[PDB]
Design a protein around this ligand. Structure first.
Ligand SMILES: [Mg+2]
Ligand SMILES: [Mg+2]
Ligand SMILES: [Mg+2]
Ligand SMILES: [Mg+2]
Ligand SMILES: [Mg+2]
Ligand SMILES: [Mg+2]
Ligand SMILES: [Mg+2]
Ligand SMILES: [Mg+2]
Ligand SMILES: [Zn+2]
Lengths: 24, 98, 93, 127, 155, 206, 80, 60
RNA sequence: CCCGCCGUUAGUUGCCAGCGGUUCGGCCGGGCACUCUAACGGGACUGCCCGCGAAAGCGGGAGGAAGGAGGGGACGACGUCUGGUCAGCAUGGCCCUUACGGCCUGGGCGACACACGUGCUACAAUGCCCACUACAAAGCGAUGCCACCCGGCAACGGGGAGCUAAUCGCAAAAAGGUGGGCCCAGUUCGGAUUGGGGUCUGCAACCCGACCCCAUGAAGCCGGAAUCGCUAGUAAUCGCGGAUCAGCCAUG
């Protein structure tokens, strides 16, 4: 759901990282 | 092992630029690391053509930075000779790192 | 399985269910099973009354949910609306 | 002993080295059935050999990089084909008629001014 | 395309069967250009046909299409006064076009919650003169078993 | 609005950069800017002389500056005292410490910038535009060259209507990225408005 | 959703002004464009007249509105 | 480009966040490029006149 | 000019491809072969064969990386419209010069119950979520890109190495592939709105920032009349980069 700021994609499409998109 | 890296905005006045550093060394020091290339960093600029409106036009413009390295191994006195004062290109920057 | 404020989630993997609760959503659903220690995947219809209760006891006594939350929210929604708070002239405008 | 072979489709560059082995082929390390995992077009990567009947006489040791898997699949097609030629130029006669020996110069057209995706121009309306 | 009459691009045969039509069909299932996905779907659907059916997967496919392919259409024209139907034979290049297109459509129209299933079956339904797929070939070739008034053209 | 600049369209081949030197990153802009300054002074001064072009080379605190004129004596001066003031005035502007050369113009009758200013002047002197034009053109045309072409803006004569004057002989191929066509633009201030003067000159091939 | 981090801000235009008034108890009307400033306890009670880009609207500050920032009770856009 | 508004070169900004590029020829501070310091217009021109080294007309 | 095959030049890119050592991460010895790098240069001209034609040119075939302008750029005639811009710049005339000059704070350029344009994200299982794992190009970086450790769910802070940069960093590319979950329901579809907490930039984020976390989880089940783009590596689809830029409303 690209737009959902709280998932994998949502992040990516937003270019941010967070609990749902760690760094490594 | 004299690392002679050359950078510039023009090639016809670079490849030569370096070649000089080349043949001028083939009479004293090692046979040198020959003139090596290296990728070029292209500065692209995009600018709408006329002023005011007309977004759909724009005109291209690039500013490319050319590189070389040369690399004179095992220097030998007579080496730093001709290399001292014997160049003729203008818009070329040279930075040596022994 | 009456859990939080008379909430009866049923038939789906627990973690998902507790979500049907005003106050629970994925995050706390996990955290619930996390602590409570109950295989998330396990269905509600296939729980252990005990299991259910711990949850019952934890979820309810750990997060302000249902009617109480709303209570808070609306209240909070008046809160600034009580004062000449612009952000409060938004619940009007 | 050893024979070269280079190909390159859609920015993908490949190196082939067929050897007098038995079937088995390796790319960058893992096996062709380990790089091209699920991809079904990986089967075609070895179609040039089947043209002359290989993979039962020759062993390929490949290395690719640059252009997405399917891109590389195709690249390998060229190398191998090309390599094969070096064993017996007598191969072409039945390799090229099927285009195995040809670089697909198809390439990502650029994306230009007043246009979304190279050719896709934005829309309009009203009187 | 004013003149030159565009030339029919020829695809590369299949990898599991090596027979044009396969890819062609494959292609129609594909979305946003995903081959593989669309690929598995057909190959999956090809498998489900060796079971639920004993007949080889290819014959079920190929023989499901020919039952689809339309042999007549209705290219409207303006005999002046109104918009006539005017029916004509289907160039064999087109039949295929519509054929496969049709299948993939009707398929997705069905109920099942899958990709292959939707495909395999409607193929199978097609290899017996049945299915929403074949239904359309019928509603079609019918608006054309008669035509409708071109007498001003005497000949 | 059309017809790209014949010069810049040819910068790659048959035509070069008025300011050739390297640098970049954190100097370019400062350095580049420095150029507009010189060209600023050289232009407001060496006018009556025939400023044609201003090459500016650099090699670190050692600029070149090679002014192109038709009447170099004016740039130079009496015995050469004025090439002392300018050369010195240039420093009070750039401490880079640079020299200044002056290359005469081989028949200015072939330097676009000049063939234009020529025309320009005439116009400001209230001279029939249609003539200065046809005049200039023939000159170039008549002093070698394989093609010339002069264009003048509007208000030709203080007309209330913005017109355009033409005239042009020989071949002048602006599309042939090889032709090597010299270009030049002369502005024309005037009691009735501003008039632009464009002059193209076509020389040989390579 | 509101965030300042660590070290809440209040322009010392009215702060050092407002406190100089708590010495003597209270004051009458405080006009300050410093609507960029947050509201602090020591402010409560007083009456600061925020600017509306045109007029100074006396904003009686209270306890049930300290996290806020003056201007929030200072409307800006009259409408329909 | 009111001469007055051309006071970016007035270091003293009171708060750096107040500084702004401005064209160094037009003043046109709208869309300037750091590298050259040229109002997108006062750049396409010089780049044509050839007064911008290596600034060749892009093309691919 | 860039992309297609090829050669020459040049190898602190690249490789057990050939050889011995390995902390098997090409790391070191070594070698420039291949890849790549960037310069020059060769190469298709219907030149070749068949056939239609007066000829041009057209159909097909062959060799070939490439075929009849190999793909795409750059390149936009004499002129049209009193087309756009006196707010990029320039300049004629008119007009203002205790002011249509200038500084400052705050506000406004960001509001709505409305309409349209151009977009993004969807309405789902040819999908969506989680874990594991794979392949890219083109750019960017000293008053900057920031590996690595610890902290915090996270945004991010604090410590801190390398790099003026093909041979350090931004970087994981995503779709993909592999296992598994969800099972058709406004539903692990959709993410709006709103509440609350919190980080950062910036003198300052109420009017008006981005972002992280929880909670809420709306319209939406694929669109009336009408209407748009695209003939290929294009459309569709999937990310990555840059300019401006403190930050940022870039879904451009
Ligand atoms: Mg979801
Ligand atoms: Mg461009
Ligand atoms: Mg509200
Ligand atoms: Mg009618
Ligand atoms: Mg001005
Ligand atoms: Mg042309
Ligand atoms: Mg008009
Ligand atoms: Mg606006
Ligand atoms: Zn400018």
């Amino acid at each position: 759901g690209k737009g959902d700021r709280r998932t994998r994609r949502g992040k990516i499409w937003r270019g941010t990282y967070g609990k749902y998109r760690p760094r490594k | 092992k004299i690392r002679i890296k050359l950078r510039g905005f023009d090639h016809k006045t670079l490849d030569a630029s370096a070649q000089k550093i080349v043949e001028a060394a083939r009479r004293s020091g090692a046979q040198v690391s020959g003139p090596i290339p290296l990728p070029t960093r292209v500065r692209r600029f995009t600018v709408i053509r006329g002023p005011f409106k007309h977004k759909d036009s724009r005109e291209h413009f690039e500013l490319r930075t050319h590189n070389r390295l040369v690399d004179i191994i095992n220097p030998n006195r007579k080496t730093i000779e001709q290399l001292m004062t014997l160049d003729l290109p203008t818009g070329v920057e040279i930075e040596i790192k022994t | 399985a009456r859990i939080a404020g008379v909430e009866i989630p049923r038939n789906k993997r627990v973690d998902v269910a507790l979500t049907y609760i005003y106050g629970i959503g994925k995050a706390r659903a996990k955290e619930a099973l996390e602590k409570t220690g109950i295989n998330p995947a396990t269905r509600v219809k296939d729980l252990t009354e005990a299991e259910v209760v711990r949850l019952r006891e934890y979820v309810e006594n750990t997060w302000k949910l249902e009617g109480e939350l709303r209570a808070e929210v609306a209240a909070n929604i008046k809160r600034l609306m009580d004062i000449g708070c612009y952000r409060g002239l938004r619940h009007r405008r | 002993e050893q024979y070269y072979g280079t190909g390159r489709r859609k920015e993908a560059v490949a190196r082939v080295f067929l050897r007098p082995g038995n079937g088995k082929v390796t790319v960058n390390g893992q096996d062709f059935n380990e790089y091209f995992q699920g991809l079904v077009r990986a089967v075609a990567a070895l179609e040039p050999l089947r043209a002359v009947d290989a993979l039962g006489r020759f062993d390929a040791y490949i290395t690719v990089r640059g252009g997405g898997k399917s891109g590389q699949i195709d690249a390998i097609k060229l190398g191998i084909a090309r390599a094969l030629v070096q064993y017996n130029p007598d191969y072409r006669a039945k390799l090229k008629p099927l285009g195995f020996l040809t670089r697909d110069a198809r390439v990502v057209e650029r994306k230009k001014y007043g246009k979304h995706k190279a050719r896709r121009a934005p829309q309009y309306s009203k009187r | 395309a004013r003149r030159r009459r565009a030339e029919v691009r020829q695809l590369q045969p299949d990898l599991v069967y090596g027979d044009v039509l396969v890819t062609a069909f494959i292609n129609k299932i594909m979305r946003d250009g995903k081959k593989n996905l669309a690929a598995r779907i057909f190959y999956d659907a090809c498998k489900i046909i060796q079971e639920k059916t004993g007949q080889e997967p290819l014959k079920v496919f190929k023989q499901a299409v020919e039952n689809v392919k339309p042999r007549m259409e209705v290219r409207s024209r303006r005999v002046g006064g109104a918009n006539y139907q005017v029916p004509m034979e289907v160039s064999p290049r087109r039949q295929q076009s519509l054929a496969l297109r049709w299948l993939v459509q009707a398929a997705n129209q069905r109920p099942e919650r899958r990709a292959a299933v939707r495909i395999a079956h409607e193929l199978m339904d097609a290899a017996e003169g049945k299915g929403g797929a074949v239904k359309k070939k019928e509603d079609v070739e019918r608006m054309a078993e008669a035509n409708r008034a071109y007498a001003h053209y005497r000949w | 609005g059309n017809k790209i600049h014949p010069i810049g369209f040819r910068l790659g081949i048959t035509r070069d950069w008025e300011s050739r030197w390297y640098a970049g990153k954190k100097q370019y802009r400062h350095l580049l800017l420095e150029d507009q300054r010189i060209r600023g002074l050289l232009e407001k001064e060496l006018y009556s002389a025939g400023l044609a072009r201003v090459d500016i080379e650099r090699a670190a605190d050692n600029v070149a500056v090679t002014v192109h004129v038709a009447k170099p004596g004016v740039v130079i001066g009496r015995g050469g005292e004025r090439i002392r003031v300018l050369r010195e005035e240039l420093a009070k502007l750039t401490g880079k410490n640079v020299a200044l050369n002056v290359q005469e113009v081989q028949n200015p009758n072939l330097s676009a910038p000049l063939v234009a200013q020529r025309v320009a002047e005439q116009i400001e002197r209230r001279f029939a535009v249609r003539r200065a034009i046809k005049q200039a053109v023939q000159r170039v045309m008549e002093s070698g060259a394989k093609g010339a072409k002069v264009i003048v803006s509007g208000r030709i004569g203080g007309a209330e209507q913005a017109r355009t004057e033409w005239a042009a002989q020989g071949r002048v191929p602006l599309h042939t990225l090889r032709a090597n066509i010299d270009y030049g633009f002369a502005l024309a201030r005037t009691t009735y408005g501003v008039l632009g003067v464009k002059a193209y000159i076509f020389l040989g091939e390579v | 959703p509101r965030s300042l981090k660590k070290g809440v801000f209040v322009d010392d235009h009215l702060l050092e002004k407002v406190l100089e008034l708590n010495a003597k108890g209270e004051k009458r009307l405080i006009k300050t464009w410093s609507r960029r400033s947050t509201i602090v306890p020591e402010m409560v009670g007083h009456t600061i007249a925020v600017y509306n880009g045109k007029q100074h609207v006396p904003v009686y500050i209270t306890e049930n509105m300290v996290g806020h920032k003056l201007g929030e009770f200072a409307p800006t856009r009259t409408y329909r | 480009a009111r001469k007055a508004l051309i006071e970016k070169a007035k270091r003293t900004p009171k708060f750096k966040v107040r500084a702004y590029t401005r064209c160094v020829r037009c003043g046109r501070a709208r869309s300037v490029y750091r590298f050259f310091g040229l109002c997108r217009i006062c750049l396409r021109e010089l780049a044509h006149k050839g007064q911008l080294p290596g600034v060749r007309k892009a093309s691919w």
